[PDB]
Every structure is written in C-alpha cells, then in structure tokens.
Ligand binder design. Structure first.
Ligand SMILES: CNC(=O)c1c(-c2ccc(F)cc2)oc2cc(N(Cc3ccc(B(O)O)c(F)c3)S(C)(=O)=O)c(C3CC3)cc12
Length: 562
C-alpha cells in the first residue's frame, strides 16, 4: 500500500519559524557565515511529502521467517511490567507537546487532576476499543543545517507524527519496560543503544580485528519510516507479545498497534485533515525499538541471502553497519549487490548503494567514524568522531536563541574526545555560560534521543565515565581529521584552532578561580590549552555517579525524560 495518502491540506506551523541564523554577537563569535546556516521549516514540507510517499512491495522468504523465529524465541525470555500512571508521567519531558484537552507537560509531571483524568480515560478506552484509529498531529521539524550547493542546497524538513500527550503517557505504561528490555535480549551485541561511545569504539575495533581479512559496509535505506509496512508493524506487535506481560498490557499493546502504530489520520496544527498514514510514525514510543528490530531482522536475513561470511552487525534504528570476513574484492562486491536485492525485496531499498570498505576508518554510520589519536603516554587511542558542520551550525543557533532541548551539550558529551568538541564547543559554551551567569543552571539535552537534565559543571565526571581519563589528554590527531575540521572552519567562518586555544586559556583561568566543580572543569577540560600541564587523576564524583540508564532507555520517537 501507499505509505501516505494526502488530502492537499498543508503541514502548518504552530508559531513563527525563523529560517536563517539570527545575528547575535555571541553566536557570531563561534560562527560568522550566518547566511550558510538555516533551519528547516514547514515551508518545505511538500517537498518531503513527495519523497516519503510511495507504494510498498514486500516479499518475505525463508531466511526472513527463520530469523523472525529466532527473534520471537529470544523475546520469550523477557519479562516486562506495566508502568503506573505516576511513573509514566515522570518519564515525560517538561517541553513535551501539550494535550488538545486542556493540560500540558508541566501538568503531567505534577500529576494534575485534569491530566490524570484524561490519561485514565485514554487508558480505559485502549482496553475497551481495539479498532478505532487514533488521531495524530503532523508537524515539520525545525532542524538546523549548513547549506551545501554541491549536494543540492537546502534539505526539506522532516515530518514528525505524534499522538496526543495523553496517549503518549499510556504508551509508556504499556510499553516502556518492553522497549527498554526487548531489543537487547533479541539482538545481543548487535543492539547499538546499549553502548557508551567508548564501548561502541571497542566493539567496532574488536569486530574488525576478529576477521582474518575484514570487510565492512553501511547500509542506508531510503526513507526507512515509509518502508516499514503494516505487516512489519504487526510483526513487531507479535514479538512484543512473546514477552511475559500483564493481561491489561497485552490488550493495550494490541490496541495501540491497530489504532496508532499501523497507521491512522494525520491532522495539521490548525485541525485540518492532511491525510492518512500507513507506515511508521516518527513520534511514537516504539519508533526506535521497532525500527531497530525491523532493520535487524531484514538485515540479518539479507546477510544470509547475500552469503556474507561471519557477519557482525551493529544496528541503531535505521542505521546499519555490517562487518564480515572478506571473500575477495569481486566476491564482496557481488555479495553486497545481493544484500541490497534482498533488502529491497524486504521493502527497504537503499538511498545510496552500499560500498565495501577495507579500512575501519572509512565506515560511516550515524554520521560518525572511528579515528585515532594518542594518549598522554603516546599509546594509540581509538575514538568516535564526525564532521562538525552540523554540530557547529546548531551550536551557533542555540547560542543565538534559547531552545528547550540543547543539542550542543549532547555533542560535547558524545564527542568529548574529539579535537573540535574540546577546542571549540567546550571553550565556546563555557565562555557563554560565564558571560550569561548560567554556569550553575541545569540544561535539557538529548542523548540517543532521550532527554536528560544535565548540569554543565558535572561534565568532567560524565566524560571520564563515558570515555575514560584519556579523553582529557588526546593529542596527535590524524591528518585526515585535522583537515576535515580545518575545512569545516573555513566553510563556516569559525575562528581557527589557535584562536580558540587563546580563549580557552582565559576561560580556564576564570574557571579555576571559582573553585569547586568549576575548578575541576578548568583543570580537566582545558588541560590541552596549556603547556605546563596539571596531573589529571580520576575524579571522585565519577565514582559517585550512576550513569547506567544512559545506554539502555533511549528512543528518538519516544518523548522520554530521565
Ligand atoms: C550502526 N552504527 C552505530 O551504532 C554507530 C557508529 C558507527 C560508526 C562507524 C562504524 F564503522 C560503525 C558504527 O557510530 C556511532 C556513533 C554514535 N554516537 C553519536 C551519535 C550520532 C548520531 C545520532 B543520531 O542523529 O541518531 C546520535 F544520537 C548519536 S556516539 C554518542 O559517539 O556513540 C552512536 C549513538 C547511538 C547513536 C551510534 C553510532
């Protein structure tokens, strides 16, 4: 069937939508080529609608069925509980889209009578009705990028589809424990979200070394969400139902599948009927879990049809990396084309055809890649990095305008060992916080989709736990990585690294003079900025922190707060 059917009504905005990066002195100090930086808006929604709309032809085979059997078998070891209303309410972010029924995120979070009354009635309705399609809102995501004329200039906005706040709370009640436990049990080491960035690196490196002659590739499915069929969404439900579940949970899961997940009507911000969805909803709790499962199932089956030898897979939502034993150059190319063919039959053809890579560093997934630096003692250290353009463009925007969720903090945490994060992002934001007297205030940032409340002053212990002490001592980065950062700076009109070094020394000093946690920031985060180096020893605070939930519970679709 058609992934979507449209009425003609436009995807409409809620409030004013700034297109171009605002001129602000502090954002300008990071990035000056403001004309290159843009936010996607509802104005480009039609362009996206065209791309995401198509017929799905799906043909399953014995390899697929074999794999699905394995998955259902593994899922049967999982025991998931219902969350209570109160528990589900606290997993709601404060910034979450308000209900159409006279309450918002703040009210959910403080268990207000009108919110709980509606949530209970929505729950009752899920148990009583299993067929009536549930209403959803369609919105155009406002995301920031840098323009690329070479690649056809401005990207069209992504479409986010979500049900009302009340339903989203009920989703947590029914499924949060399932989406938290199931993927890991089913996929084991292939489940991407379990890994901290440091662990992810170690996993990729060992997988690479475990082959006599390694070959790797990434597979990018064109419009993964549109490729997910009704039957894929029902297969997911069948898999959820393999777990040991509460009776009410089973009813609610089945209702949410048939009334919400498989499809339903799309309403714009002005209440107009936009059309109907028959594919994955971007803004539901199960999006991340479901996409990972379906991708994994299709990929694992496709590996077999492709005749790939000794396959190690890493799956994060629609992001797939496979590392395997090479059969020869021509043999590998051949098997990769057969892989693509299998995936296509499974309804998930590529955006760009996958290419074999015989060097680990060349594999790009989730827009990241492995690279090499050296630690204090000159030992080789691997770490995850990425092209800094988008992180920098967003960082500038987020300086110019207050955004409820702050991606820059996420990037500092996620890419802490990197040259660009340490020298530019850290220096910049610590100088901005100092300038605005916001150094002690907690911020909301997203990590692997989940929304977190993080104090900037806790950055050092967080980094140590996620990346190790070496993250504060890396030097002698690779020439490729330096060149990529350099090229990014030129393109965006960001000051050069040495300029940042000077600034970082000043920031460091200001931080050290405040004592306490701020001193530790100055000491550990900016040790690179001075020749006369302080001794970096393990931080006590890191030990006295529990960071486990960080690499278990994250769903981009999910509206999750920790
Ligand atoms: C299947 N691919 C992988 O699982 C990952 C590879 C990869 C790279 C090369 C290779 F050969 C194989 C795999 O790199 C990764 C780096 C990240 N990080 C950043 C990051 C990147 C994008 C998003 B997002 O817009 O969805 C995000 F939320 C975070 S992070 C913090 O550093 O670990 C992640 C995190 C969980 C999403 C996954 C992978």
């Amino acid at each position: 069937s058609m992934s979507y059917s449209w009425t003609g009504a436009l995807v409409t905005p809620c409030a004013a939508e700034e297109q171009k990066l605002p001129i602000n002195a502090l954002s300008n100090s990071l990035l000056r080529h403001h004309n290159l930086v843009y936010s996607t808006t509802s104005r480009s929604a039609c362009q996206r609608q065209k791309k995401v709309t198509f017929d799905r032809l799906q043909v399953l085979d014995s390899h697929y069925q074999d794999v699905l059997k394995e998955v259902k078998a593994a899922a049967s070891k999982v025991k998931a509980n219902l969350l209570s209303v109160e528990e589900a309410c606290s997993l709601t972010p404060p910034h979450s889209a308000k209900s159409k029924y006279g309450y918002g995120a703040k009210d959910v979070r403080s268990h207000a009578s009108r919110a709980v009354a509606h949530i209970n009635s929505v729950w009752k309705d899920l148990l009583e009705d299993s067929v009536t399609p549930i209403d959803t809102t369609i919105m155009a995501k406002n995301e920031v990028f840098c323009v690329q004329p070479e690649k056809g200039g401005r990207k069209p906005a992504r479409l986010i589809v979500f049900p009302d706040l009340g339903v989203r709370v009920c989703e947590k009640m029914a499924l949060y424990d399932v989406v938290s436990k199931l993927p890991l049990a089913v996929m084991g080491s292939s489940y991407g979200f379990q890994y901290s960035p440091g662990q992810r690196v170690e996993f990729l490196v060992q997988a690479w070394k475990s082959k006599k002659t390694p070959m790797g590739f990434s597979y990018d499915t064109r419009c993964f969400d549109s490729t997910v069929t009704e039957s894929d969404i029902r297969t997911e439900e069948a898999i959820y139902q393999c777990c040991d579940l509460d009776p009410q949970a089973r009813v609610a899961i089945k209702s949410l599948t048939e009334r919400l997940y498989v499809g339903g009507p799309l309403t714009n911000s002005r209440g107009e009927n936009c059309g109907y969805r028959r594919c994955r909803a971007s803004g539901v709790l199960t999006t991340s879990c479901g996409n990972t499962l379906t991708c994994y199932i299709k990929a694992r089956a496709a590996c077999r049809a492709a005749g790939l030898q000794d396959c190690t897979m890493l799956v994060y939502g629609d992001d797939l990396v496979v590392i395997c034993e090479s059969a020869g150059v021509q043999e590998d190319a051949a098997s990769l084309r057969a892989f693509t063919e299998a995936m296509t039959r499974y309804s998930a053809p590529p955006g760009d055809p996958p290419q074999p890579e015989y060097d680990l560093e060349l594999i790009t997934s989730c827009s990241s890649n492995v690279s090499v630096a050296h630690d204090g003692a000159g030992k080789r250290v691997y770490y995850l990095t990425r092209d800094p353009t988008t992180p920098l463009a967003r960082a500038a925007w987020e300086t110019a305008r207050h955004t409820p969720v702050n991606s820059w903090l996420g990037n500092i945490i996620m890419f802490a060992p990197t040259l660009w994060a340490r020298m530019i992002l850290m220096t910049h934001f610590f100088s901005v916080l100092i300038a605005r007297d916001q150094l002690e205030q907690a911020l909301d940032c997203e990590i692997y989709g989940a929304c977190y409340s993080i104090e900037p002053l806790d950055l050092p212990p967080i980094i140590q736990r996620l990346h190790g002490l070496s993250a504060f001592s890396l030097h002698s980065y690779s020439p490729g990585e330096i060149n990529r950062v350099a090229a990014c700076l030129r393109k965006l009109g960001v000051p050069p690294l040495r300029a940042w070094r000077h600034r970082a020394r000043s920031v460091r000093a200001r931080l050290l003079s405040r004592g306490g946690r701020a001193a530790i920031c100055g000491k550990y985060l900016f040790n690179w900025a001075v020749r006369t180096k302080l001794k970096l020893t393990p931080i006590a605070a890191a030990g006295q922190l529990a960071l486990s939930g960080w690499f278990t519970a994250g769903y981009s679709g999910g509206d999750i707060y920790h």
